[PDB]
Amino acid sequence: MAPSRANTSVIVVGGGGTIGSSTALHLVRSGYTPSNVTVLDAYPIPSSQSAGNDLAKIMGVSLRNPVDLQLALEARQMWNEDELFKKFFHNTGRLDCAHGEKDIADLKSGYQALVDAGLDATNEWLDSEDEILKRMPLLSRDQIKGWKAIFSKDGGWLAAAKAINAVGEYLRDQGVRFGFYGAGSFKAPLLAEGVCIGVETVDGTRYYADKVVLAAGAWSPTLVELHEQCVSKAWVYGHIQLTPEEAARYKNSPVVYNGDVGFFFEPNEHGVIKVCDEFPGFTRFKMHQPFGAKAPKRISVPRSHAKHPTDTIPDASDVSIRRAIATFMPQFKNKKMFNQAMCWCTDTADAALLICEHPEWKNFVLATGDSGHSFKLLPNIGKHVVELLEGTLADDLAHAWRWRPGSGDALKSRRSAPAKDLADMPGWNHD
Ligand SMILES: Cc1cc2nc3c(=O)[nH]c(=O)nc-3n(C[C@H](O)[C@H](O)[C@H](O)COP(=O)(O)OP(=O)(O)OC[C@H]3O[C@@H](n4cnc5c(N)ncnc54)[C@H](O)[C@@H]3O)c2cc1C
Ligand SMILES: [Cl-]
Ligand SMILES: [Cl-]
Ligand SMILES: [Cl-]
Ligand code: NA
Ligand code: NA
């Protein structure tokens, strides 16, 4: 007879990443026996190639629809109040800025949506250079001519690697089982007459459990057949070094974001500032056969920086990140950029998550579709994956997250354009 919580075993594939580690965290917190939880990943938690594993990330701009609202609020509560996560959230505030008549109009209606969702207390509209420089004087009046902004008091950045590592340490201490590398890289579900009973990894190690969760990020559509519900894309970052004097000047600075430029935020403990641009992402299409598809298909397969650490970023991304520096930090415009790299995410057509049982395999549950904006949900997203496993997922979440092949083009998703492909963007490959 099929089990209580204490007797239920769960494998989390990709449990070294954002959604996976959250899932393992909430299994244990909700009272699964730790030894009954297995975390499998290609790399040790925090996984080298996890989009959530770098020294610092920003919370980022919320999406403006009610499910994302509720998730981001859940997350915010936990980043403020959860003893595990609190210490890694740096509540510097955020400026979401815009320039151009269309962009500013969209920013303003976005602002109104926030007011109308009841976030008026923590968001203010800034309608001049002066009001923006008040919130961050270190911005350049020349550069932000005619900018307007939303300032969010609740915004900030996240010691992301440190957070996932704290989760990993907690899982470890509690007695979660780990397999990494050959013993952690998913190859295929184990199936008994149409029902999933485990997974086999690349090196042929077999694991058995009552539930399997595929939280494999950008790799999810490469591992099992998803009929293009998820299309995986790379974004880019670089770093600049500030002197101790400069770093101290920039300390406690808000996150600054502009959708036409990119973002940056305060330097870390080592006086390093991370800079990103904003763009529709890059695919890397090639032939690959997920499991559960008759035949190899052209799909976007991440080019992993962990597998290929000599990779950088396309020349065009160097140019766009440079432009961001020159706009945000004109006085640093000559600083050398280092540790430029790509991180991989996976887009759904509607940019909502894909968290559902796989129609073909009972007890095989997808938890992916992160759509380039889910790191903020590290604290909370696992709770809802567990809910799904337990049949208790709220209706609206289950709906937003449901299986939905053929329901839109994820290559474009909600971005401004279909992603370009790395094959056509020179300068990242240094083999
Ligand atoms: C530059 C950049 C800026 C971003 N900005 C923001 C932001 O401001 N705010 C925000 O909320 N989000 C942001 N995102 C997105 C955020 O990083 C992701 O949405 C989130 O981290 C993805 O979570 P995930 O668990 O789906 O994937 P990941 O964290 O990448 O985890 C997937 C895991 O699966 C593992 N895996 C892969 N293949 C296998 C296999 N065969 N077997 C076992 N395991 C496997 C991987 O090793 C990895 O650990 C940003 C991302 C990038 C790259
Ligand atoms: Cl932010
Ligand atoms: Cl300076
Ligand atoms: Cl490759
Ligand atoms: Na990293
Ligand atoms: Na200034």
Residue numbers in the entry: 1 to 431
How does the study describe this entry?
N-valyl-histidine derived from proteolytic digestion of the N-terminus of the HbA1c β-chain. Fructosyl amine oxidases (FAOXs) are FAD-containing enzymes that catalyze the oxidative deglycosylation of fructosyl amino acids such as fructosyl valine and/or ε-fructosyl lysine, which are the degradation products of HbA1c and GA, respectively. As members of the FAOX family, fructosyl peptide oxidases (FPOXs) are also known as candidates for diagnostic enzymes.
To investigate the oxygen binding site of PnFPOX, we attempted to soak NaCl into the crystals of wild-type and N56A PnFPOX, since the bound chloride side is considered an oxygen binding site in MSOX. The crystal of PnFPOX N56A with NaCl diffracted well and the structure was determined at 1.8 Å. N56A showed decreased oxidase activity compared to the wild -type, while its dye-mediated dehydrogenase activity was higher than that of wild type. The analysis of the protein channels of the structures showed that the W1, W2, and W4 positions in wild-type PnFPOX (W1′ and W4′ in PnFPOX N56A) are in the main oxygen-accessible channel. Although the oxygen could be accessible through another alternative long path instead of the closed path in PnFPOX N56A, the elimination of the accessibility toward the short pathway might result the drastic decrease in oxidase activity compared with dye-mediated dehydrogenase activity.
